[PDB]
Design a protein around this ligand. Sequence first.
Ligand SMILES: [Mg+2]
Ligand SMILES: [Mg+2]
Ligand SMILES: [Mg+2]
Ligand SMILES: [Mg+2]
Ligand SMILES: [Mg+2]
Ligand SMILES: [Mg+2]
Ligand SMILES: [Mg+2]
Ligand SMILES: [Mg+2]
Ligand SMILES: [Mg+2]
Ligand SMILES: [Mg+2]
Ligand SMILES: [Mg+2]
Ligand SMILES: [Mg+2]
Ligand SMILES: [Mg+2]
Ligand SMILES: [Mg+2]
Ligand SMILES: [Mg+2]
Ligand SMILES: [Mg+2]
Ligand SMILES: [Mg+2]
Ligand SMILES: [Mg+2]
Ligand SMILES: [Mg+2]
Ligand SMILES: [Mg+2]
Ligand SMILES: [Mg+2]
Ligand SMILES: [Mg+2]
Ligand SMILES: [Mg+2]
Ligand SMILES: [Mg+2]
Ligand SMILES: [Mg+2]
Ligand SMILES: [Mg+2]
Lengths: 122, 129, 205, 82, 156, 80
Amino acid sequence: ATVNQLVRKPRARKVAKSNVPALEACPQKRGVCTRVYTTTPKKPNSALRKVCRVRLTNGFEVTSYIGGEGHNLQEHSVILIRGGRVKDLPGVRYHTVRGALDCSGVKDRKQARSKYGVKRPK
Amino acid sequence: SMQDPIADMLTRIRNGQAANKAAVTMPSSKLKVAIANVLKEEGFIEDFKVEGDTKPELELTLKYFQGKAVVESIQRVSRPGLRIYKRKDELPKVMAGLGIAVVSTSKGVMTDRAARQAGLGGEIICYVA
Amino acid sequence: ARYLGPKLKLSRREGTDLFLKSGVRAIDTKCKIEQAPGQHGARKPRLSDYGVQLREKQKVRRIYGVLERQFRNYYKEAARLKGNTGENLLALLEGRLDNVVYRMGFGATRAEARQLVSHKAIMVNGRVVNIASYQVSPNDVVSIREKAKKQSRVKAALELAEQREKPTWLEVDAGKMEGTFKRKPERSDLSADINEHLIVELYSK
Amino acid sequence: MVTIRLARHGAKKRPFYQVVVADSRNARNGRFIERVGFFNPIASEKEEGTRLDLDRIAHWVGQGATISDRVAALIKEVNKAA
Amino acid sequence: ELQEKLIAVNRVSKTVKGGRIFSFTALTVVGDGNGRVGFGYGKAREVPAAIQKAMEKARRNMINVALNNGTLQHPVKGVHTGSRVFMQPASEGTGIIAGGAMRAVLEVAGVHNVLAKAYGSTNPINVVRATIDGLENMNSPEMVAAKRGKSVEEIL
Amino acid sequence: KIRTLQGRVVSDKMEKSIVVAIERFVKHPIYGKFIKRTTKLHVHDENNECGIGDVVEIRECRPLSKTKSWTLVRVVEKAV
RNA sequence: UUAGCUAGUAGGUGGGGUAACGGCUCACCUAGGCGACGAUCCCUAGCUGGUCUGAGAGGAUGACCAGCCACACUGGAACU
RNA sequence: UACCCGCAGAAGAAGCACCGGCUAACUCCGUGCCAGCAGCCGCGGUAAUACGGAGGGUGCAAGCGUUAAUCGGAAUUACUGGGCGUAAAGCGCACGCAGGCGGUUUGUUAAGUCAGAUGUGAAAUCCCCGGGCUCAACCUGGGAACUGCAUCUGAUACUGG
Ligand SMILES: [Mg+2]
Ligand SMILES: [Mg+2]
Ligand SMILES: [Mg+2]
Ligand SMILES: [Mg+2]
Ligand SMILES: [Mg+2]
Ligand SMILES: [Mg+2]
Ligand SMILES: [Mg+2]
Ligand SMILES: [Mg+2]
Ligand SMILES: [Mg+2]
Ligand SMILES: [Mg+2]
Ligand SMILES: [Mg+2]
Ligand SMILES: [Mg+2]
Ligand SMILES: [Mg+2]
Ligand SMILES: [Mg+2]
Ligand SMILES: [Mg+2]
Ligand SMILES: [Mg+2]
Ligand SMILES: [Mg+2]
Ligand SMILES: [Mg+2]
Ligand SMILES: [Mg+2]
Ligand SMILES: [Mg+2]
Ligand SMILES: [Mg+2]
Ligand SMILES: [Mg+2]
Ligand SMILES: [Mg+2]
Ligand SMILES: [Mg+2]
Ligand SMILES: [Mg+2]
Ligand SMILES: [Mg+2]
């Protein structure tokens, strides 16, 4: 790494890829759910996480985790995915924006309500 | 081979001081005479002495204080692979004023403090810290 | 743009008295100042590094009533000026207007000073100032206006202030309800519990 | 032609016109050969409101540069304030 | 008089025939508030016994740092066996810009205006021993005057 | 006085036109090592007095052809 | 993980043309020129003053504002 | 219209995220590898400070968050500023063109280098003093900077010829 070696062959920069490639640098892209199905995660956890397999707006086909405690999602219904890797489901990188545009919020949740789309209680 | 006589001189000073020599010796030259003159002026050697008619040996008598070395660190700046020519505002100030930096200016070889008081840059040969 | 909560929760949370109430009553008699506020308030952990810098910053913020982006702009201006950074930050927070009204004693506390300023009652150089965050300058008069000259709470606040100790970088003549910011204060004239290297380290993280 | 005119650099309800020796066929805020002075319309009391380098202005008027209406009135105002 | 700051309390483990044996160490620095520091490393079976032993080992074998008013005398690099580190003098009154263990050892050391940066690995042990090395190899201009055989205004 | 350069000669195989390798000495914009870069100029000349190895002083003129815009003012070191 | 490219192509002389030099355009001749200091080829891109970040060297980027370039349904051509 | 003046009443005006460590902020109740949280380490299998609810608090505040995107931290592309025995890394070894670097003395040249001046780096922005909009954002005067380029004039230590 002398300066003659540097001008003969330059110091190559450190480029790297985005971990959410299907969003196309859009913060929320709108997907149509083709499937909604449960999967048990990879060990040492054990549950039945709900992954909705959506076809995005730009032709991409990705599954995406569903948050909250329970849901209402079927197929044929447009939702918004927002990125963010769920650690324990192998090969799922997106969450669904709970509250957005067909997927209503959790039932009777009182705290953290903006993250799950629930109006103020009176 | 001997691709840097000035770094030969500086490495000999650093080695002799870190190995507790008293009178180190090297082959002489005009730039070595000028740099050793700067060091004897500022007080990083006791006295230098160039002996020899056709090809001489320059001898440097090293200083000590309480056993420890006097030159704490000494290094090149403008090595021959990559030379460092510096303008007057972009001059160094090694060790926040304490150490000296030898600059060859148009008016011979002189310490960077004298270079700032004469108002011209040059080439930085060493950072006697 | 303010904090409208129970003020002794702030005073009890820091532990030091923030000069948040008047002084007719002893504030240790007013609140249970010994324990911390909340339920688990008899617990005192070995307070961490983020904790100790946050506690010094929040003590200054809740003494002077200044919110966070206002404080961050005061820090940016303080580090931007010449001289010592903490000295300049305390100089700017002292050169706020409602702090000047509290030091001259026209309002009871700093919050009452904020209400007195904000309700159109202070004349800096004979000019109405409607804003609690006016910056005052050296050699500058500051006076109460004529529709506020009759208010009983001003002379009650005056008797409370001249019961308290006086600030030394000001001139006051309360028989006119006025005074003058004679010189910008120093670090030495202020209090010593307010520390400064913690604030400059927290906003230079 | 090249004119000496006024470009309105300011904010809402409170303009501030800087005079420019600019081309005719450019924009108002566009390029200019040389900037000479300014005129603050809502400039207050006890201060200076208008400042024009009459040396460079008369140099350009000799050089063939015309005048504008408002800066003509302003040059008359400066030489009257003399 | 001497103010002391703990830095870290680690939980080392030695594996024997029965099982693991959990011990606790302690890395506490102590100093006067000026150029006199001593770090200390203690290690015992329970925590306050370890930190008291660390405080004794720091309360002796201290250092002698000559100083300016509250700031260093030159930029220093200091390396010791995990880490090289770089700490720099600052203007008057600008906060101890460091962190982790450098912050604790410098605010105990009574420097008050520094600019530091920890390169390499940053274990608390390694970086406090390297910071102590940096404060060692820092020297006063009166010391450099006596050393070089000049006067302090001749160095300027 | 005239802004004129000096460089060597690569070749002269075509007529009334030489090509000149000006090796100007530049600082490198990041690493600071003074590397050399030789720029070639198609230089016009009359009667073809120059050949490979000549050291020519040249000035810029009106463009004599498509890629040739420099004519010479004096010629030193004619041979090897 | 593109090493060859270039036939008006590199230059000359003569004619023509242009507001103006010039293969800009022709006739004839010379056989050249470009290339590992990256030619040619592929993919992406308006550029700059700047903006964001950074202690700094730099990294990313070109919204508003200002300068320059290009285009006006797509592809051309000329007139005034 | 800016702004000033008069009216009557505390009336018309506070939310969002978080609380296991990193990270400021803890206890009870409902669950029981279920429901779920997750930015990483990991939580949940019958006393869950990590899931859901309450109480309390902490942080921001007319905003608060989640996502996307850049830089920093990343000295994790290192010129300033890394490394090569064993962690990833010395071509299997030599010859050698181009390229890079070149002992020592003198003389000249002055290309690189340095220094002064000239032209220039549009204005806006950035920054330093200042002025105004009651304050600030914002608007604006003067100044340096515009780390460059070119030209003239010098100096000769280093490097080059
Ligand atoms: Mg606000
Ligand atoms: Mg300061
Ligand atoms: Mg590391
Ligand atoms: Mg022709
Ligand atoms: Mg003709
Ligand atoms: Mg950085
Ligand atoms: Mg067109
Ligand atoms: Mg068309
Ligand atoms: Mg929360
Ligand atoms: Mg905590
Ligand atoms: Mg949560
Ligand atoms: Mg169990
Ligand atoms: Mg339970
Ligand atoms: Mg959590
Ligand atoms: Mg980096
Ligand atoms: Mg990153
Ligand atoms: Mg490494
Ligand atoms: Mg191995
Ligand atoms: Mg290996
Ligand atoms: Mg080998
Ligand atoms: Mg060999
Ligand atoms: Mg040589
Ligand atoms: Mg020269
Ligand atoms: Mg400009
Ligand atoms: Mg003002
Ligand atoms: Mg020479």
